[PDB]
């Protein structure tokens, strides 16, 4: 499996790079989030607990996955700002707030 960076945004106000991933799997099952943790910290080039994994869907039979990840400087900022699905998929926090 191979992770490549397609697209890079620089958001200054909050101090993060917003980043697009294409991840491959050829003859292999759908990418495994647990190895992708190990692989991520090097690709983004930021500490391991502030390099964040989000969004992947995986094509039907066409072996390419499209996806998004975050690289943050600020551990403080990230839990607060971000929409809850990310925080659980990375493993940070759950679901914020009920009724």
């Amino acid at each position: 499996m191979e992770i490549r960076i397609k697209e890079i945004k620089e958001n200054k106000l909050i101090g993060r790079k917003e980043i697009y991933f294409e991840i491959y799997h050829p003859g292999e099952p759908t990418p495994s989030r647990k190895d992708v943790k190990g692989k991520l910290v090097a690709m983004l080039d930021l500490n391991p607990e502030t390099t964040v994994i989000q969004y992947i869907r995986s094509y039907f039979g066409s072996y390419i996955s499209k996806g998004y990840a975050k690289a943050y400087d600020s551990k403080e900022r990230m839990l607060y700002i971000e929409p809850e699905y990310i925080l659980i998929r990375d493993g940070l926090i759950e679901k914020k707030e009920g009724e």
């Binding site: 200054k12 106000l13 909050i14 917003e18 607060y80 700002i81 929409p83």
Partner: protein, 241 residues
């Protein structure tokens, strides 16, 4: 309906915001303010959609509150606000400046112009009328107003260019429209064009009043006096489809 609609629907959201109209079922309805709801561009659309700086309305509301936009020289904080046409929207945090302009298509586009022009806002005033102390006051369709004169005939009837200094809310450098002046066309079906007025002559009585113009290409157009908006001798640049 017996009350202001507080909810706008997505299928009621136009094609002029260039928005997906089957996305949910509820569209962002600004609270009453400068401008019309369907002829505005929402603050939600500008942060969230346009630039990718939000992926939820909570991101975009938090981002606006901390600060990433000032509109007309002053602070905003919620995403509900109808941004007008011929306004000045600012990213202080990126240094971008935009004009809110029509296309030939008639969708709102933010058209980039330099940091310099952010200072300027051209006004062509909506009506001119007396207030107490025998002073006349200036008006707009975004409600942007100034007071204090000595009355009298003054610069024009109502077809003005003012240079407006936006943090100060001051008027400066007044200028008439002529029969050799510039207009950009910002309502009607002839929108996006910028040219030189041939003559401002019209149909002298009743409700219709024509004004006519030629351009650089030199096409002949006719539009209402109300839909003639005087840029000046050019201050902002043209809008592109």
């Amino acid at each position: 309906r017996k009350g202001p609609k507080r909810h706008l629907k997505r299928l009621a959201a136009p094609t002029s915001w260039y928005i997906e109209r089957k996305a949910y079922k509820w569209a962002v309805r600004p609270r009453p303010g400068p401008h019309n709801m369907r002829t505005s561009i929402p603050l939600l659309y500008i942060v969230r959609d346009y630039l990718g700086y939000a992926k939820t309305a909570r991101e975009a509301r938090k981002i606006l509150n901390e600060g990433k936009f000032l509109v007309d020289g002053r602070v905003r904080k919620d995403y509900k606000f109808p941004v007008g046409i011929m306004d000045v929207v600012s990213i202080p945090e990126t240094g971008e400046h935009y004009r809110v302009l029509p296309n030939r298509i008639g969708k709102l586009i933010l058209h980039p112009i330099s940091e310099d022009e952010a200072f300027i806002k051209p006004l062509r005033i909506r009506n001119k009328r007396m207030i107490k102390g025998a002073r006349v006051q200036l008006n707009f369709h975004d409600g942007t107003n100034h007071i204090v004169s000595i009355a009298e005939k003054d610069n024009y009837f109502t077809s003005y260019t003012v240079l407006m200094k936006v943090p100060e809310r001051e008027i400066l450098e007044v200028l008439p429209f002529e029969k050799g002046a510039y207009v950009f066309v910002t309502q009607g079906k002839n929108v996006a064009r910028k040219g030189r007025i041939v003559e401002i002559k019209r149909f002298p009585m009743g409700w219709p009043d024509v004004v006519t113009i030629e351009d650089e290409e030199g096409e002949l157009f006719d539009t209402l006096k109300e839909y003639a908006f005087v840029v000046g001798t050019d201050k902002p640049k043209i809008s592109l489809p």
